[PDB]
Amino acid sequence: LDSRLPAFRNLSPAARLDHIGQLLGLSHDDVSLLANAGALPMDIANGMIENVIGTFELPYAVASNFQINGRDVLVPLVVEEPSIVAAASYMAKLARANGGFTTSSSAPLMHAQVQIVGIQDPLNARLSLLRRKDEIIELANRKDQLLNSLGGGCRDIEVHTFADTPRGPMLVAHLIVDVRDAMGANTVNTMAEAVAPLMEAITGGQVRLRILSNLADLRLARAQVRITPQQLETAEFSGEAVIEGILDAYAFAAVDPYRAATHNKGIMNGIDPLIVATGNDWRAVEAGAHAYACRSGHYGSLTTWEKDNNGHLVGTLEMPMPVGLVGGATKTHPLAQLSLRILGVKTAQALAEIAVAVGLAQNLGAMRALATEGIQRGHMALHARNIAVVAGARQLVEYHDVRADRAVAL
Amino acid sequence: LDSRLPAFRNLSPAARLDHIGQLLGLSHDDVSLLANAGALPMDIANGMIENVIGTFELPYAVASNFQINGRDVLVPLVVEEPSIVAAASYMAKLARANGGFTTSSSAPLMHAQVQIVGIQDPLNARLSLLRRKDEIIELANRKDQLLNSLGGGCRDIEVHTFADTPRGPMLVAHLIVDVRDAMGANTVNTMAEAVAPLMEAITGGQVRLRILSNLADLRLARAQVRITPQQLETAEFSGEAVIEGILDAYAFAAVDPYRAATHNKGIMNGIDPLIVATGNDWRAVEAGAHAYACRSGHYGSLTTWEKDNNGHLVGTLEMPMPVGLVGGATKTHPLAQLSLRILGVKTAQALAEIAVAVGLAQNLGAMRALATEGIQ
Ligand SMILES: CC(C)(COP(=O)(O)OP(=O)(O)OC[C@H]1O[C@@H](n2cnc3c(N)ncnc32)[C@H](O)[C@@H]1OP(=O)(O)O)[C@@H](O)C(=O)NCCC(=O)NCCS[C@@H](S)C[C@@](C)(O)CC(=O)O
Ligand SMILES: NC(=O)c1ccc[n+]([C@@H]2O[C@H](COP(=O)([O-])OP(=O)(O)OC[C@H]3O[C@@H](n4cnc5c(N)ncnc54)[C@H](O)[C@@H]3O)[C@@H](O)[C@H]2O)c1
Ligand SMILES: C[C@@](O)(CCS)CC(=O)O
DSSP states (O other): OOOOOTTGGGSOHHHHHHHHHHHHTOOHHHHHHHHSSOOSOHHHHHHHSSSEEEEEEEEEEEEOOOEETTEEOOEEEEOSOTTHHHHHHHHHHHHHTTTOBEEEEOOOEEEEEEEEESOSOHHHHHHHHHHTHHHHHHHHHHTOHHHHHTTOEEEEEEEEEEOOOTTOOEEEEEEEEEOTTBOOHHHHHHHHHHHHHHHHHHHSOEEEEEEEOSOOTTSEEEEEEEEOHHHHOOSSSOHHHHHHHHHHHHHHHHHOHHHHHHHHHHHHHHHHHHHHHTTOOHHHHHHHHHHHHTTTSSOOOSEEEEEOTTSOEEEEEEEEOOOOSBSTTTTTSHHHHHHHHHHTOOSHHHHHHHHHHHHHHHHHHHHHHHHTTOSHHHHHHHHHHHHHHHHOOHHHHTTTOOOHHHHHHO | OOOOOTTGGGSOHHHHHHHHHHHHTOOHHHHHHHHSSOOSOHHHHHHHSSSEEEEEEEEEEEEOOOEETTEEOOEEEEOSOTTHHHHHHHHHHHHHTTTOBEEEEOOOEEEEEEEEEOOSSHHHHHHHHHHTHHHHHHHHHHTOHHHHHTTOEEEEEEEEEEOOOTTOOEEEEEEEEEOTTBOOHHHHHHHHHHHHHHHHHHHOSEEEEEEEOSOOTTSEEEEEEEEOHHHHOOSSSOHHHHHHHHHHHHHHHHHOHHHHHHHHHHHHHHHHHHHHHTTOOHHHHHHHHHHHHTTTSSOOOSEEEEEOTTSOEEEEEEEEOOOOSBSTTTTTSHHHHHHHHHHTOSSHHHHHHHHHHHHHHHHHHHHHHHHHOOOO
16 A cells, blocks of 8 residues: 555545545445445444434544555544644655654553552552462453453552552552453453452452553553654755754753643644544543653653764654554444554554554654744644634635734735 | 433433423524534535545533533533443532532633743843843734734743753743633744744844643633532442542542543543534643643642531542633534534633533542442
8 A cells, every 4th residue: 555645635535535445445335434424323323422412523534654664554533623634644754755653562451450448557468469469360360261362361460559648548459451452441440340359358458449540551652753854954944953953842842841741732633633533532542641741750741852873863752552443432433443444453552553653743743843934834824714714815814924813904 | 591401311312402402592503403414514624624535423412410600501522432421410410409510710821932042141031031021022912913902912921941951051931821712822822933033132042942831720720519428328338438438539549640640531531522512622621631730740630529527528620721712623613613502601711611510520420430339
């Protein structure tokens, strides 16, 4: 497959869809799911959440140029904000010239928390649990034989203590569970419930919360990118100057949480729409992302940006990325299934790797604009329709002055 | 308005929609938006983002029972995950018996950062910049006379310095901007780019980033809720015991970031679907939320949970909440406009207050379920 998508930006939605259909060999019925509204039937929507009165659409787009470990990939994105898809496609275009994005991921390990209270000896109780960890792990795995046959299952436990809280001593056991192609929530919650009575017997305490942690720091996905100065040169700025500016932007994010929040928001502009497109839980991914960003005791940047020994700009993104191909609404939504088909992913960790490549590209796009002509020239041009509506035209403002004041005057 | 919506959970989507239309007096055209698929025309969708090939639906629901400062409100939500809408609705029902949710909010103030590098005397330059803030403020306000005519605009400047970075000292000016009924990002970004040359002239450095901060801690929204023990009694547990269990769950979130992340995730389960329903940017709300949670250098709980002197469970949520009634895609999407119609909100800060009430309710519902589940 070739993901360059020639002239995609200027094709109609229908023509874009036909091209995508041809590249992938989509059936007429697959294409019909995007060519017509209503792919999520009301009986499905009504069964997904409560008090349903209809459905709500967001645009479904495809970012171009992405390449993951040498293979071209098409990336579906669902979001309401302009310039995101364009920026991601642009930075992916640049990345192609230098090998695309290089990615990897850890095993899909999730934490299941079991909170224990009502004991005066939590530090001792912790050792009692660790002494009998095999028995606990076996009980957890008895509860899900299928997962174990699929190559997943509870691998280990860790135990943490909070002996002095304002509500008294607490002990917290974590089951560490390989959840294969699931996000993992229902899978691990069931194991936490199963081990609870055994943990009460071992410790003499009372189990309270049995629940996954969204701080999924053992389920990491990683992306790398490289950009050369010749690629970043503009009429106003040398490529070398742009790279230095991007490093200045990165250091700013690393020291100031007011910047880091926005910097990381820019990453999630790329990631969350891929999560939505695949029927996955975007709140979970957001919580894992931002909590991980403060793991040091300072809220910093999820990405890294440096200059290598050849003067090239090199970036990384390593972060928690709990996603599924099964579970939740990933199988329920016909377009979630179509998105997975478009992506070509065969494991959840493969989707996770695409997600961090997109987030890395997204961050790069923001920083490149910010370090050069500023964010407004390119972004507001694609927002110009919205400005015309707010004012009460779009082509005229595209003369580099997209402001409501100007729209009012015209 | 009466938001109780008796029997709502068991009615058909069509009957639910009818009951909503009656209560609000929705027009025929408004009801027709939700009745037939494809409310976002492709012409509109194709203009909103790039490389569009279609649209993607999520369920559109209404939470019941919410009451904000004594006034009943209906809350539209767009999300894929079960239990959220029911939990919000049920906790809202319990809240009604004790006066509903009480809310307040700050003015709609947003930060715009201007980063300046290569200054030899950044601490001195900061005072030089501050001394001339009125000029800078005036210059910023020239870019948006419409905003100023409506009572918004740049109000002040603050300046921060970072002495220790690997790339040298940095001066960071913040424009403080009242953005009225907009979320404000594009608004303040234009101002930041507009004042940068003048700042550069005053400080002698090189301007780099000109960009809003998503850590919108001058745009706070607040909610309170109260629940009595009698409301929380179950077959297995006294209401008093459940309250103690909820306080234990809260303390767990306050000390352990592994729990806090999940706890806060539950809050955003309530908030983000309202943000989506009103055509607002949910990445901005998420970033402000989680960054605010760790402003102390420890990632903790956004909510608080306490027992008052009468033994009642009392909860708070104070957090950044940048949202708009105008701007972004809020006017462009027909269902975003319908959502705003259903809500009845007249200002962006009113929408922000409803958002935190819904987040608070969702957290309560999540904790209540976890605190009352029997050991198997
Ligand atoms: C791309 C761009 C918008 C325009 O690009 P230029 O005019 O400078 O350059 P051109 O030579 O015309 O195109 C180069 C390539 O870009 C593709 N492309 C361009 N237009 C496209 C379109 N309409 N449709 C589809 N694709 C489009 C296409 O692949 C094209 O290749 P080809 O056609 O030559 O094959 C450019 O300006 C940009 O990336 N801005 C950053 C925006 C951002 O970060 N937004 C996040 C939200 S903002 C906020 S929310 C994020 C943030 C800033 O707050 C985050 C933070 O603070 O860190
Ligand atoms: N990191 C981020 O959060 C970030 C960064 C850049 C852009 N954005 C995007 O910015 C957009 C929101 O920008 P915005 O809120 O400035 O909207 P906007 O730019 O679409 O419109 C704002 C304009 O609306 C006009 N206006 C008319 N009536 C008004 C009223 N009653 N109150 C206030 N303004 C009024 C003003 O002149 C103002 O300049 C979103 O699409 C968001 O996704 C977000
Ligand atoms: C139940 C919860 O995980 C939401 C499920 S999406 C939130 C929490 O644990 O407080």
